[PDB]
Structures are given as structure tokens and as C-alpha cells.
Amino acid sequence: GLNLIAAHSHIRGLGVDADTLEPRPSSQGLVGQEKARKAAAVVLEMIKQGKIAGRAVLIAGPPSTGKTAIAMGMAQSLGQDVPFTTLAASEIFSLEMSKTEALTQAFRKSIGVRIKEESEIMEGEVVEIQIDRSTGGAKQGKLTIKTTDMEAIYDMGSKMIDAMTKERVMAGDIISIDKSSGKITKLGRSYARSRDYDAMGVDTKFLQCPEGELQKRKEVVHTVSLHEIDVINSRTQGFLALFSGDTGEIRSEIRDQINTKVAEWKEEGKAEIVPGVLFIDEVHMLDIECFSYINRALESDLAPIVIMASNRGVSRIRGTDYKSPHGLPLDFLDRVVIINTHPYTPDELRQILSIRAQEEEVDLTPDALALLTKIGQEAGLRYASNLITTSQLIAAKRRAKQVGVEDVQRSFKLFYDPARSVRFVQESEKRLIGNDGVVDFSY
């Protein structure tokens, strides 16, 4: 489909025993990281429980240690029931809005208003439409519709006859009508009438006739974020800015009104509030102004849980000239509990490579899997994982049905790991442009 195979495609969840929060040694595509997966599951539990507001969790550990994978596993194990917002910290440096506004909108996106509503929908196959159009138009008309269980005839009001003519509704068409709006969606063409559709090309699909009553109440459960309500109220087509962007800085008094109204809907029982998650990937790309805003944004009642990942050691905080762990100021780190990811053992690399060789359509011979495991220890999990794809493509060039050591050796030879890449750089320093701008082009 339109989803291709990607680095996290094998992550199907968090892989944790829901009855105990005990991490299974592997399941759902996660291998090892047990203590981190347990902690992320305790966070997952209190996300679903909703009662706790505005806690920040940092996931800290070396690169390629499963920090994003654990974040993806939580998103896959929350699903649609909870808003999940993913933010690269690079994203808030907008030219449309100040970074605290962008960071506000991200917090607003992570709280859902859940609104439960009903409508009568009428659905069936058009048996015939008569419209007289009596110079003039839309004067009078009759509609016959059937399911497999019933047939009925309707006199149409004139603004419904406009809708029918607007949708060019025809005998044999399977339609739904939402009654209160009066919109008509043509779900398809009935197969029994296929002969009538002489203008439709042979690529046209057909459907069986609907089933049950012509009319029923269908309940829709909308969830709309606080950010969407904020943007809707900004201007006469405010929602149109939810797509194009081009929201301004939304005025604070609009948000404060909306918070009061959402508290009314909660107290009136018309809506539920559904606290989500904001995941800030590589949070160290934020600067000292951002962290100061976050500190008090987390103290709001309508704050999500915030989950964060950092590669960084003791490192220079952006927008200042001093260093702190993770590159995060200690005053912010005071508000944050930290989950650590550790490096993988060779058998865990073997398992992750196996899983990655299941998600990609690749057969590894046992010696090729052993060699990729050895390469994974020497050159890192990510590089050996990129040799999997390379080896399959080389094997297919030699038309092999399974990837052999020869294909992995060709991969290792053709594509350098980071360490050999650095060593190549440390040897080529006269041909590569130095930090001084100096370079020699002669042989």
C-alpha cells in the first residue's frame, strides 16, 4: 500500500503483559529494554487513566538504543482512544509564530474533547427517481428506495430535489442520506443495475444492495482537540487554517474562553475530556526560552503527559553558553523523571535483525544472520539493519533465493560503516575540505 517498509514498521506495541506490566523477553516486536519498557508501560497506564496531569518523562540513552522504538510502541499501544502528538523539537522554530505559541499549539493538540452524537441515516438502493422539473425546476418528485428487507416511496421537498439533482442520483445508485443535513453520498452502484450504467467505464466497481431498515440512528463519537476549537474560533473559516497552517498567534482570551466552555460541557455531561500525549523527539533542540514556558505549561490542568527523548550527554544548552546533562537546564530536569535505555547484547541484536528480516521480505541463511550480528556488534545495529536490504538486492542480482554470506560481504565492502567512514576521513584530510577551509586538489 501507501505505507512502505520503514525503520519502525515492526513495532506493533510495547510488548508488555497487560495484567502485571511485566515485559515479555520479546513480544509485539520489541526485544530487551525490559526495564525501560516496564517504565513506559507504567506511563502508559497513567496516560489511559487520565487522572494525572502534566507530568514530563525523559527517555535518555545512547543513539540506536530503542528510545524512538519505545515511543512508537506506546503510540501503537494507545491507538485512537487517546490523542498522540509527535513533535520534533526543530518544528517550533516557525516563521509564522513565536516558538512559545507553536509550543502552546502542541500542548493544545494533545487534549481531546470527546463528543457523542446521533443522527438518522437513510440508506438503500434507488429503485427510481421521478422529478418533474416543471422553465422552472424542483417542483415535485418521488423517490423509491429499497434495502433487501424493505422498499419505500417518499415525496421529496424541493431542497431535497436540488440535492438529488446536484448528486445526479440515478436508478440503481446506492446512497446514504443524512437527514438533518440532507447530504447524499453515493456509496456505489448496485450490481443488478450494472446494465443501466452505459456511461460508466469497465473499471467501475459495483456493490450488493444494503441490508436492514432503510432508516436507523447511527451514533458518531467525535474527538476534537482543544487546538482545533481554538483555531476554529480564530476567524470565519478558522478550521481552514488547521490544514494550510497560516494560523497566527491565537489570542490568549480566545483560549481562556474555550477552557471555560469545555469545563461547562464537562460539568453538563455533554462532552468528555480526553488527555493525550505530546512526545518531544530530541528535546535538546529546544532552547532556554522554550524550557521556561514548558515548566509552567505543565502546571495547567489541561496539560497532557509529555514524553521526551535525548541523545545528549552533558552538553551546551541552546540559547545560552553553559552546559548541563542532556543539554536540559536543571530547573527543567527537576520536573522530569528519566527512563534509561542501555546498549544491546549480541543476542538481542540477533533478534532485532531477525525481526527486521521478517518485516522486510528477506530470507537470511543462518551464517548470514550470524555475520550480520557480528557486524552489528562492530558497526552498530542501524548499519547491519541497512545491510539486510542491501544484501537482498545483491542476492536478487545474482538471482539467489536466500541471502548468503557472499551478499553480506558485498554489502560490507560496498557501504562503509560510521567508523570506517571516519577512518576514511582521517586519512583523506588533505583531499577533504578541512574546518580551516583548506584543501589540496592536486594528485
Q: Are 68 and 219 spatial neighbours (Cβ–Cβ below 8 Å)? A: no
Cα 162 from chain centroid? 39
Q: Is residue 442 at the binding interface for a copy of itself, with CB under 8 A as the rule?
A: no
Residues that bind ligand ADP (CB under 6 A): 7-8, 11, 29-33, 63-69, 352, 355, 381-382
Q: Are 375 and 384 spatial neighbours (Cβ–Cβ below 8 Å)? A: yes
Longest Cα–Cα distance of the chain, Å, equals 90
AA identity, residue 315: S
Confirm whether residue 191 is marked as ligand binding.
no
Shortest separation between residue 288's beta carbon and ligand ADP, angstroms: 16
Query: Which residues within the stretch 87-106 sit at the binding site for a copy of itself (CB under 8 A)?
Result: none
Nearer Cβ to a copy of itself, position 41 or 317? 317
Instruction: Work out whether strand 215-225 and strand 111-131 pair parallel, antiparallel, or are unpaired.
Output: antiparallel
Q: Binding partner of residue 368 among a copy of itself, ligand ADP, another protein, none, CB under 5 to 8 Å per kind? A: none
Q: Euclidean distance between the first and final Cα of the chain, in Å?
A: 50
For the chain, the residues before each gap (C–N > 2.5 Å) are 134
Confirm whether residue 65 is marked as ligand binding.
yes
Shortest separation between residue 218's beta carbon and a copy of itself, angstroms: 42
Contacts of 87 (CB under 8 A, 6+ apart): 106, 278, 279, 280, 281
Confirm whether residue 8 is marked as ligand binding.
yes
Shortest separation between residue 16's beta carbon and ligand ADP, angstroms: 12
Q: Binding partner of residue 322 among a copy of itself, another protein, ligand ADP, none, CB under 5 to 8 Å per kind? A: a copy of itself
Query: Which residues within the stretch 332-361 sit at the binding site for a copy of itself (CB under 8 A)?
Result: 334
Q: Is residue 31 at the binding interface for a copy of itself, with CB under 8 A as the rule?
A: no
Nearer Cβ to a copy of itself, position 157 or 245? 245
DSSP letters for 66-112:
SHHHHHHHHHHHHGGGS-EEEEEGGGG--SSS-HHHHHHHHHHTTEE
Q: Is residue 436 at the binding interface for a copy of itself, with CB under 8 A as the rule?
A: yes
Q: Binding partner of residue 46 among a copy of itself, ligand ADP, another protein, none, CB under 5 to 8 Å per kind? A: another protein
Confirm whether residue 434 is marked as ligand binding.
no
Shortest separation between residue 369's beta carbon and another protein, angstroms: 19
Nearer Cβ to a copy of itself, position 276 or 329? 329
CA 177 vs CA 119, 159, 167, 183: distances in Å = 10, 13, 11, 6
Nearer Cβ to a copy of itself, position 198 or 334? 334
Cα torsion 63, 64, 68, 74: sign = negative
Q: Which residues contribute to the site for a copy of itself (CB under 8 A)?
A: 317, 320, 322-324, 329-331, 334, 433, 436-439, 441
